[PDB]
């Protein structure tokens, strides 16, 4: 039994906050990954979006005798954290709970990371409940916070700044973000990879057309944070940490550079990365930055290219976990 801890605040407050928790489970063989279904015995209202079938290009490597053979094909996965637009943003109002997983994989095995997001009211209704994923049971524990006004962060009770203007103590908090595909008809407002390129590039990249955004939750509970929100200091912070740690923040053995075709029907290579063996470390899921219409990739045993300074064959991860410093008061 794994443990997914939810830190519950003393009050609901302004209504629009969500709780979030997550746990990384033990390795399962690859052949079992396509069968994985999240089950819930919990007394909450599961959003059905994530358990539908979702098309991915599977990209894999084998030793050959540069010394690699890669290949790819299109498959359907279910239960992954591909959250539709507005679902997280309006979950406090709809009273919907999002439960989904990401995959961190080597060639032969995957560690699912289960994410649970939902309304703060769940803390009134629920002390503990169970999720299942394949053969693993997950104990969700809702636990009331030691603090009076904030959250337990690095063993310290902390409340961040709230005002919209400019004016403190500084505490480093966890941020968890989910990639959302969202197109507009006209212009470049949703061209997410262009935002990264302005932050970390010298010269002009021609074709990074992916349209979407990240939706993030800060700490154990917060209102959703949209990335990018141009004049928000927290958005700026998350983007900068993403730009320097594109596979998130926290033995794996690097073998070499690999390329491949995504989707597999492409005549030439559209993706690159670094093949590895040993313990999976980063998530193995992302989207090509080059296509407006998302091309989703699952690349077990390969760290797909996420360096924003590169122009071609790069990706954005489906989920991203890191840390940002927040100004506020320790109490
Ligand atoms: C992908 O990652 C997975 C998980 O990280 C990894 O598979 C695991 O590898 C370890 C070690 O390579 C396996 O450990 C074995 O566990 C059994 C359980 O009873 C032990 O009995 C074994 O012990 C013997 O082997 C050791 C070899 O050094 C000795 O020190 C020891 O005294 C024993 O003789 C053994 O350690 C584990 O079972 C698997 N896990 C899974 C889920 O299959 C895998 O190697 C990674 N894949 C790649 C391609 O890198
Ligand atoms: C991210 O990508 C850029 C461009 O490929 C890499 O920048 C080069 O890095 C080498 C060694 O650090 C330098 O000698 C080159 O002059 C750099 N070129 C440019 C255009 O900046 C960068 O190292 C990559 N970051 C990684 C792999 O972490």
Numbering used by the authors: 27 to 91, 102 to 203, 209 to 291, 301 to 381
Share the article's original sentences.
Low resolution three-dimensional (3D) structures of Tula (TULV) and Hantaan virus spike complexes, derived by electron cryomicroscopy studies and combined with biochemical analysis, revealed that Gn and Gc form square-shaped oligomeric complexes on the virion envelope (Battisti et al., 2011, Hepojoki et al., 2010, Huiskonen et al., 2010). Here, we describe the high-resolution crystal structure of the antigenic ectodomain of Gn from Puumala hantavirus (PUUV), a causative agent of hemorrhagic fever with renal syndrome.
To facilitate soluble protein expression, a PUUV Gn construct (residues 29−383) was truncated by ∼120 residues prior to the C-terminal transmembrane helix and transiently expressed in HEK293S cells. The crystal structure of PUUV Gn was determined to 2.3 Å resolution using the single-wavelength anomalous diffraction (SAD) method. PUUV Gn forms an α/β fold (∼40 kDa), consisting of five α helices, a 310 helix, and twenty-two β strands. The β strands assemble to form five β sheets, which associate together by the formation of a β sandwich. The two molecules of PUUV Gn present in the crystal asymmetric unit are almost identical, with differences being limited to solvent-accessible loops (0.7 Å root mean square deviation in equivalent Cα positions over 327 residues). For both molecules in the asymmetric unit, three loops (residues 92−102, 204−208, and 292−300) were not clearly visible in the electron density, and it is likely that these residues are either naturally flexible or require an associated protein, such as neighboring Gn/Gc protomers, to impose order. No higher order oligomerization was detected from the crystallographic packing, supporting the hypothesis that the Gc glycoprotein and/or C-terminal regions of the Gn may, in part, be required for tetramer formation (Hepojoki et al., 2010). The PUUV Gn fold is stabilized by seven intra-domain disulfide bonds, a pattern well-conserved among hantaviruses. The PUUV Gn sequence exhibits N-linked glycosylation sequons at Asn142, Asn357, and Asn409 (which was not included in the crystallized construct). Electron density was observed at both Asn142 and Asn357, with the glycans extending away from the protein surface.
